[model samples]
Target chain A: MDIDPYKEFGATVELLSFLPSDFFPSVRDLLDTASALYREALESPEHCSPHHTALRQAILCWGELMTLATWVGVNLEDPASRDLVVSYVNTNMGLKLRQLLWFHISCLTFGRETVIEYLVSFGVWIRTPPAYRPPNAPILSTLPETT
Target chain B: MDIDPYKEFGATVELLSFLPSDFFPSVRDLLDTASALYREALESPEHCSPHHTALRQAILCWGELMTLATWVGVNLEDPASRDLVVSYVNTNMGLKLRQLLWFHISCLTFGRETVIEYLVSFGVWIRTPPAYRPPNAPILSTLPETTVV
Candidate 1:
């Protein structure tokens, strides 16, 4: 729970600078929320609920995306897989796939704008601005933060 | 806020049969949750906290994974991307990436075991069962479900 994703997963800022500094940690939390939701679905007297299952499925899907994204970043170093990795992410189908996730996640209850921000930051999306002075801003001091 | 993924995303049981019946819906929720968390970090007094940012990062990573996985499922029908798609998912690098997600998501505070179960169900992870009478298995009788396929 206290692990450093950069050290543990080699998530170098160079690779994901397109996203926020806290991108990795958000991914971590979403999965846990998804996982805990799954437990609820399984234990629910009726097995699962729509909203409950929706979040879980969405989270797991994100989990799958991380797997592939990180794979590309790590493999960018491998002479053999570099081309393939590049091809995979650049592929139109791949882009469309990412778009689909962007579209769907936006439909959910919470984080509609938030999801939009990260996707835009990740370069999976592009657009206008939340605007004003080219500005925007998060929490705690002496605790070390990233974004 | 009330859209059905089966209709919106075409997430039929025919494709994600290996996962929970509500798999698509769960994916929807997760992204929203991730999205919301992203908002929290962006607005946080310091831009983000360790644990706060951890969950957001993990969720978005999964979002990327979903993008790829769903692409594979949806494209199985297309003439051009089929071979490329198959090639992409089966690659060693691809598998390694997925495993990395499995390892990291499992490290979080909640859903450690639950994630293990869904990934196992997705065929991303394999195991001995959580074993019982050949194993077992959703919600709302009138809402319609998919896993039966």
Candidate 2:
């Protein structure tokens, strides 16, 4: 059909006028690129892989993080754009770290020490260790036996 | 520089694709039409109008509601579009009633009897009377006479 759903939706949002002008910071091309990367990351078989090596785990985690970061960072390249998030600190920018399995699955295997070390070198407060578990370790119910 | 912000935003939304396909059921022209109608409605001086007439007040309330309803209803022309809001019962679609001042100012002047009567003609349960006040009347504080100083 000659009509475009996306264009129509976009116009509707504009009419509603809920969002501020700088709602999205991504380049038009990169949105598609990010979608592909995200899909590929999800489709990877750590995924259905027979074995989960530390390298494989690291690759899995880093690939996902790197792909996602590439998408987000492209938009925030300019100082003006970065200011949209928070106080635009070139060196001391804050961050959020999520993922429930970050410690058990990703960290236990790859253990983001090197990346966190690299991130710390940039002179930012490392409030959240993205992948951290106590040395005493793995305290939980016996759900694994049932599983 | 020639890029339209709306068009750019439209393209961006298409890329992100968050909302469902049938987000807005509007005719394209009516969007601009709605904007003009809304602006004119807002600019009307009920507004800065000298006296709030029952006629003037009814006009004021109805004009805002009518202006808004015109905009919303024009898009919901088809039955398929109307389904986006709730049940498409010709008589019994549920509704939201807002306006804290609906009772005090607007209702006291025009206590939606006629419209409610018209609305009830559709055979719907009238849960909310649009404007309602107690017959006991305006009780108050002594703060008014203190303005004499």
Write model 1 residue lDDT over B40-100, tens digit each, in one string.
4423434133333334434444444455556555544543334444455545334433433
Worst 10 residues of 2 chain B by lDDT: B91-100
Any idea what lDDT model 2 has? 0.26
Q: Residue A84, candidate 1: how far off, in angstroms?
A: 5.1
Chain A only TM-scores, each candidate in turn? 0.30, 0.20
Could you tell me the lDDT of residue A24 within candidate 2? 22
Candidate 2 chain B superposition, TM-score: 0.20
Tens digits of per-residue lDDT, candidate 2, B1-149, equal 11111121122222212222332222223223333333343233332111112112222222323332343345444443333222211111111111111211222233334323322332222233436533332222235634866
lDDT: which candidate is best?
1
